Amino acid sequence: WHGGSVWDAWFSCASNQVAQVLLTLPYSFSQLGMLSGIVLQIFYGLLGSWTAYLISVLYVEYRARKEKEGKSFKNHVIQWFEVLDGLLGSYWKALGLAFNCTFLLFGSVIQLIACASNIYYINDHLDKRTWTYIFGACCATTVFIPSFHNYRIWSFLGLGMTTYTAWYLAIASIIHGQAEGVKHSGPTKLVLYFTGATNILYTFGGHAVTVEIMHAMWKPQKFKYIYLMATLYVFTLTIPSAAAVYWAFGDALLDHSNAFSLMPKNAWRDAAVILMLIHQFITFGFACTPLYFVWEKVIGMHDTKSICLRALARLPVVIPIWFLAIIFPFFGPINSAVGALLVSFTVYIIPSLAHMLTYRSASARQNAAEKPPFFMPSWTAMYVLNAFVVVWVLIVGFGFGGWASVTNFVRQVDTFGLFAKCYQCK
């Protein structure tokens, strides 16, 4: 009944997403408001915790089904598409593989964009496109990276830096005060409201892709609701900073998708920028490996003796990332687009549909691995909740959210143009 092996991967992904999306929350607040912003944050955090629970339950089910026949996974890490293939069929393996690949690609693109933006805000002698030139090389010389373990130790430092950045933002905006005449408009247009809602949905989207089977022996008595504990700490990180920055700076955030552009300049802001950039650069070396792994699986040059051949096979994975990070440098709305188009299907809809399909027949409900938990004492309860999750994330998270986000993105293009030199620079 290994559960703690999945919590590590999920916590790593969540702690990465939070720090990736922290700086663009006041923008979405100014688009939404305070009431709607806070309420949607709480709503989506709870939904994300619920889906992560289902992912853990499916992992345990698959493992217990496969160990019954006599197949061992020693010295191997289970993949999510392997789980879907072992539980449902082939089409689900295909769907999982495709969506995971696209999601990792665009996560890498977004991280490169963020690095360029922050390095601009520490030194502004070179425009953001030249900083993208410079950092593309430093992130394309990463093809020589082997498989790195120990994600938990790095995650517990990433959180230790994100907490400093968040509380700096909050306390600095509180001490700065608010200027005279600052206006708070609230929700006025629909496209703005829904692109903000989708940027909020993107925050709590993180899931386990590869889980090590080494820690199946552990069984602790203090790990009851670790998912809810992680979500509560993420709330403590993300609500005060965004609320304080929005309250202090008003409507001037619709033209600044990076909150470092409005804060005053002193030593503490320099420390915050430096800590954010270092964290952002390292997590690229941790997010690269799965995509390289899958690609080398496709090309078949995996068991290679010359490391240089691995670099030659991996260059066509870094070239489109660099080209996309140069051509579309939109730091704010790209989160909304990626969210609406990929996270709604990867984190929210496919886990629920898998849990609703694998347990349809009573022969699989009587011989299940894990019974329904105490807070959901019946199967009908879980089916109703999964149906609501699917319908909601299909209508709002993809219907209105996708349309609004794509229209906002196209307006950004028609305003700034292809290959923008400096996006939102005075």
Question: What's the gist of this structure?
Answer:
The chain has a single domain, classed as Amino acid/polyamine transporter I (Up-down Bundle), CATH 1.20.1740. The protein is 71% helix and 1% strand. It has helices spanning 4-21, 25-32, 34-69, 80-87, 90-122, 128-140, 151-176, 190-203, 226-249, 267-299, 307-327, 333-358, 362-366, 379-416, and strands at residues 77-79, 210-212.
Describe it:
By secondary structure, this protein is mainly alpha-helical. The chain has one domain (4-416): Amino acid/polyamine transporter I (Up-down Bundle), CATH 1.20.1740. 71% of the residues lie in helices and 1% in strands. It is built from 14 helices and two strands. The protein has helices at 4-21, 25-32, 34-69, 80-87, 90-122, 128-140, 151-176, 190-203, 226-249, 267-299, 307-327, 333-358, 362-366, 379-416, and strands at 77-79, 210-212. Strands 1-2 form a two-stranded antiparallel ribbon. Helix 1 (4-21) runs parallel beside helix 9 (226-249) and helix 5 (90-122) packs across helix 6. The longest helix has 38 residues, at 379-416. The radius of gyration is 22 Å and the shape is globular. It starts with a helix and ends in a 10-residue tail after the last helix. Residues 59-93, 152-154, 212-224, 294-314, 358-383 are cytoplasmic. Residues 36-37, 115-130, 176-190, 246-272, 336 are extracellular.
